[PDB]
Design a protein around this ligand. Structure first.
Ligand SMILES: *[C@@H]1O[C@H](CO)[C@@H](O[C@@H]2O[C@H](CO)[C@@H](O)[C@H](O)[C@H]2NC(C)=O)[C@H](O)[C@H]1NC(C)=O
Ligand SMILES: *[C@@H]1O[C@H](CO)[C@@H](O[C@@H]2O[C@H](CO)[C@@H](O)[C@H](O)[C@H]2NC(C)=O)[C@H](O)[C@H]1NC(C)=O
Ligand SMILES: CC(=O)N[C@@H]1[C@@H](O)[C@H](O)[C@@H](CO)O[C@H]1O
Ligand SMILES: CC(C)Cc1ccc([C@H](C)C(=O)O)cc1
Ligand SMILES: CC(C)Cc1ccc([C@H](C)C(=O)O)cc1
Ligand SMILES: *[C@@H]1O[C@H](CO)[C@@H](O)[C@H](O)[C@H]1NC(C)=O
Ligand SMILES: *[C@@H]1O[C@H](CO)[C@@H](O)[C@H](O)[C@H]1NC(C)=O
Ligand SMILES: *[C@@H]1O[C@H](CO)[C@@H](O)[C@H](O)[C@H]1NC(C)=O
Lengths: 116, 552, 552, 94
């Protein structure tokens, strides 16, 4: 099993920056893909950024360029660097991990609030 | 930028840069010479003129059933042909191993570091202008478009070779002992440091995991009883690390050698069968050796089960997959007067080609139920309620999906199927045609020749432009199959060398191990040499149901 | 209590208990049959009748110099003789390996666990009534009395073969890469997980250690300059773990691949020469490949130095030790048409027999100084003061001690010599005569035949009583030497199979590695195939002083 | 290097792989010799060949052990090879 714990969220003004951290522990060997997702009040959860164990990154159109996802393998931490935070980026940001194999489990964090 | 980016050296010649803008091919022992190892030596010309194509040999092995029946009953002739199969397949595998995802040249790091999957072909260098070297566009096509256009299942296509779900779950269970990707490091790394058939998926990769799984009495493994039947023990009783979703009660957290086997009831079926087989061999060996202690009973039973595994994989599993009318034989003695390296390193491309996602059916049919993926996954109470006997009977009857031919990846597994495409790109795999040449196959000259049809080929040509930049993994799934076969040419001619080398490379096949006293005497030796998928199920499943890897 | 304690099975047959009071021998492929594998098959009778004794072959190889000079100049004949040497020696070594200190029977634990030294003979079971099996007293004689009576040096006995201190420190430096006992677990365990000639004593056993030792420019290793001369870097600059007494200043804590090499200036001599050789090969490769990066420069240089090491060990080191007039040859191609396993596992008995304590002289004679053990140990300022050139000149002139013949262990190393006896007992070694039969040697029938004299023999008879209870390690040091030789029959006939197997078992000798492109081209390939101890010193020691392993 | 700290205990840390033999020594007014090798071979002073026998806990890297026994007891570790280093602890009444 893999445990995920987000941090780094908070209240900022337009144009500010914020680095989200996702600390992972447990069966890290099984995680083929890491991801960041956000859920604004009243709207569906949407993809923000993903990175595979091999380093393939993908971003949503609305965040590409000003958001950056990366993994620190030594610290088992997936970071999401957010810049140029417009008020439309206000949501609960969740960390996600996808396991290898067609049977693989999906893991989700507890979320961290980003109000801008 | 690199002079070797175009892969100029042919016939297993090796490219070396000799400056910023020129290369040199090492044609040593290729049978060829010249700038790119394309001028054949005289003896090479004769051998090439007389060598039949794989498709021609496959035809001979899949026809003339009456002639093969005579051959199968002449032991000297059966041994001569099996020996040639072993030696010719083994010649295609570098052993000791060479490249890996980080080393396109031979290095002591690539040889010594067992955490890497090895590589039959070196990776494309980082500074090459295109993903495949120099050909093709700057970027490969969107793998999501490749997946949806030629890979995803529309209607279920059954395997015309009749592969059933006992076969599908056996392939999954068996290969999960040497395909154990360490994603913490990357898709090119593995946790299976034994690099072969050591049965760590039964006994654990590490000694402390093995000891937690062992009873330390009579050499047996710990077990529990549920409804009068033997099953693997619990995580609570063993403290063994397993992967379970948080809603699984402790009563159903089974502890087995491989930590993901509790996630699919088809794998827990085989995990239970093999655990019963271990304890059964302990009982047999204890009767033969009342003076033996727990440790020797355990170690000898493990060596016997390794032998049973290789025996079953060759004469039942590969036998079915091949479709040959020739009766394959597990016989280590065939290699004793031959040159052969008793060692193996698991190749990344072997892992990649084994992603047989189209095998999976649309539902898992047990008795009269048709379970969906959502219902079947993680639900081991399905196994307990129906029983092990019923699982064997049902999965023997249920047809599996054809792997080649295209458009048979079930939509439920589309995300991991796309991952198999992407992971190949992350590891800088060379193209399909480079791998075809590496295994003595003629390069495909078009997408239509690859698929044998028109519709998927046009789709692929619009996405890839050039057949020489078509990728290995999606090509395996859309390849034109052999007549009424599950696979195309590329799958067999790559998978077979990796497969047989991994089986015979095992140390128990070496002459100093392949003797009766290694397995506790003639009785234990006979358990190996008479093993089969039917006897495995008959001895360990109540009622001794009929089973095979083919539907009847 | 164990019915195999008496070691009843002969000719490499394997003993298996069949009940509490009965056994059966597995004579598979031994060439014999019958209850104890003592009845020879028809063809075995012929081969045994035609086989000459090691002493007969040793005489032929050490005489008729004019004939061998002709033979050495006929390449076809030289190759054929060297091929027979390699193949006949390798036949004596189990590969894949079998037993270790914990497993007297074959098991997956003993095969797969690389932390063990392997065992050419299984340990004596714990329930056997005597240390050697069933023969002898309930306790072996006091190892302190054995040491004092026939092992300790009275007067320094020089090696009649002329082995010098360049040889002695080369032997120590070379073997410290694969004899790396992990005493945290016990004397039967090793930290050299490569089990062979990987040059981890230069590059480090682990990637982390290697990366701290590397400059990461031009493929080179880090270094410092002291008085205009290149030396290994400091611990402070690299942060690698080394073992130094608490009085060594920081500026004298050299950082090298092996953590104990700073404790003796003789080892630091070879560590400096080999570090210079690596960077010298980096310069040559960089001139051949200006397009190469640091990583490939480093890895290719390491493969070249591995080849240089094997070349020197065969054609200089083993050439000197053998005393043969036949010129040995390092040629991996000799094995390409033979059956040979390109793998190696280091044997505990190989480690034990290599405890050549009598080699050490009473003093270390450098220039006009004669340093004691206390003055020489840990004092690397001796190397900086005299310089590398003077070290080579002096140690080429200083004679080393005779290993066989008895009574030549210097009193300064009494404790470690006694530990070599005791550790053999801790690992439950079988007797000397069991090891002689294991390597096709006639068992000794008395202590006088073992020693070739009467005084030491009588001491040994009073202590051991029965020649079949004599221990392997003290026998090696007291054995009758060959005429004017450093060793007796048991040392060579055990040490040669281990040596050659460990040398040719390296993957760089396999056909897919043994090609010019592996080593950066013909320039790099030629560095291996022209290497010698004299060229190593000439290229890396100021002034190019003459050197060899024999005093002139 | 190997650090020894005494405290029925000798806690060891460092280059434990190099220690072929552990030993207990006692010393008011010469130092005298229990020893145990990395393989378990035990030797004892005749005067003390009775009570307190020596033992090592490999998992914890710890070596354990009349008015005539009053002395300062020291822990000792001997390294492998003829070049090996000797390590001594810091060392008290009956
Ligand atoms: C096998 O190779 C891998 C890949 O280089 C090594 O893993 C690296 O280890 C170093 C030092 O421990 C780290 O700085 C890197 O970040 C690691 N890389 C990855 C991708 O994990 C591994 O240590 C090697 N194994 C051995 C036994 O040397
Ligand atoms: C190789 O064998 C050794 C000896 O059995 C293993 O070391 C032991 O590890 C277990 C648990 O990890 C401990 O309980 C023992 O006390 C250890 N024994 C010793 C002597 O150290 C080692 O784990 C094995 N290696 C592998 C990779 O399994
Ligand atoms: C990529 C490629 O075609 N490389 C070479 C080509 O330059 C050469 O003209 C030909 C004849 O030797 O061999 C090939
Ligand atoms: C994975 C698959 C390729 C396994 C497989 C299938 C067929 C064969 C036959 C014996 C052959 O060598 O042609 C071997 C291995
Ligand atoms: C350790 C020692 C025995 C090294 C050694 C000495 C001599 C020989 C010759 C070539 C032989 O094989 O007889 C090989 C190795
Ligand atoms: C699991 O299967 C059982 C049948 O034994 C069924 O009752 C239960 O609803 C299933 N649970 C899920 C989550 O599918
Ligand atoms: C070995 O075999 C012989 C018969 O050839 C038998 O007499 C003897 O008892 C057996 N055992 C031993 C230890 O010699
Ligand atoms: C160290 O060696 C030097 C010679 O270079 C010598 O003068 C000095 O006395 C030695 N020191 C010790 C402590 O032996």
């Amino acid at each position: 099993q893999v445990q995920l714990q987000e941090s780094g969220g908070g209240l900022v003004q337009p144009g500010g920056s914020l680095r989200l951290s996702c600390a992972a522990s447990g069966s890290i060997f099984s995680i083929r893909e890491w991801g960041w997702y956000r859920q604004a009040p009243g709207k569906q959860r949407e993809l923000v950024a993903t990175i595979t164990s091999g380093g393939t990154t993908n971003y949503a159109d609305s965040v590409r360029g000003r958001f950056t996802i990366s993994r620190d393998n030594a610290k088992d931490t997936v970071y999401l660097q957010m810049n140029s935070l417009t008020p439309e980026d206000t949501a609960v940001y969740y960390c996600n991990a996808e396991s290898d194999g067609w049977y693989g489990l999906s893991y989700w964090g507890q979320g961290t609030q980003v109000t801008v | 930028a690199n002079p070797c980016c175009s892969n100029p050296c042919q016939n297993r010649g090796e490219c070396m840069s000799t400056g910023f803008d020129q290369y040199k091919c090492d044609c040593t022992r290729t049978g060829f010479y010249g700038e790119n190892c394309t001028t054949p030596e005289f003896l090479t010309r004769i051998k090439l003129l007389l060598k039949p194509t794989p498709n021609t040999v496959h035809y001979i092995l899949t026809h003339f059933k009456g002639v093969w029946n005579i051959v199968n009953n002449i032991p000297f002739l059966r041994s001569l042909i099996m020996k040639y199969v072993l030696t010719s397949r083994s010649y295609l595998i570098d052993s000791p191993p060479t490249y890996n995802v980080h080393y396109g040249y031979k290095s002591w790091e690539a040889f010594s570091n067992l955490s890497y999957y090895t590589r039959a072909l070196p990776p494309v260098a980082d500074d090459c202008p295109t993903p495949m070297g120099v050909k093709g566009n700057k970027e490969l096509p969107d793998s999501k478009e490749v997946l949806e256009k030629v890979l995803l299942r529309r209607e279920f296509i059954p395997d015309p070779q009749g592969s059933n779900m006992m076969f599908a779950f056996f392939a999954q269970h068996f290969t999960h002992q040497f395909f154990k990707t360490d994603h913490k490091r990357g898709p090119g790394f593995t946790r299976g440091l034994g690099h072969g058939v050591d049965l760590n998926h039964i006994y654990g990769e590490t000694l402390d995991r093995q000891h937690k799984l062992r009873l330390f009495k009579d050499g047996k493994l710990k077990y529990q009883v549920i409804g009068g039947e033997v099953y693997p023990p619990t995580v609570k009783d063993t403290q063994v690390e397993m992967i379970y979703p948080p809603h699984i009660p402790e009563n159903l957290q089974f502890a087995v050698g491989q930590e993901v086997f509790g996630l699919v009831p088809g794998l827990m079926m085989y995990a239970t069968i093999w655990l019963r087989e271990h304890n059964r061999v302990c009982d047999i060996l204890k009767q033969e050796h009342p003076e033996w202690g727990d440790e020797q009973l355990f170690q000898t039973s493990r060596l016997i089960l390794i032998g049973e595994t290789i025996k079953i994989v060759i004469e039942d599993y590969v036998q079915h997959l091949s479709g040959y009318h020739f009766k394959l034989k597990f016989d280590p003695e065939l290699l004793f007067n031959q040159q052969f390296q008793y060692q193996n390193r698991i190749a990344s491309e072997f892992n990649t080609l084994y992603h047989w996602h189209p095998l999976l059916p649309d539902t898992f049919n047990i008795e009269d139920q048709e379970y969906s993926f959502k219902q079947f996954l993680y639900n081991n109470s399905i196994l307990l309620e129906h029983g092990l006997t019923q699982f064997v009977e049902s999965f023997t009857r249920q047809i599996a999906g054809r792997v080649a031919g295209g458009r048979n990846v079930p939509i439920a597994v589309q995300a991991v199927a796309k991952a198999s495409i992407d992971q190949s790109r992350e590891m800088k795999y060379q193209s399909l045609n480079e791998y075809r040449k590496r295994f003595s196959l003629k390069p495909y000259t078009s997408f239509e020749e690859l698929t044998g049809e028109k519709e998927m080929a046009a789709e692929l040509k619009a996405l890839y432009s050039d057949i020489d930049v078509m990728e290995l993994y999606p090509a395996l799934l859309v390849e034109k199959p052999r007549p009424d076969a599950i696979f195309g040419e590329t799958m067999v001619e790559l998978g077979a060398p990796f497969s047989l080398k991994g089986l015979m490379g095992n140390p128990i096949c070496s002459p100093q191990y392949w003797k009766p006293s290694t397995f506790g005497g003639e009785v234990g030796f006979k358990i190996i040499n008479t093993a089969s998928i039917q006897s495995l199920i008959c001895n360990n499943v109540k009622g001794c149901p009929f089973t095979s890897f083919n539907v009847q």
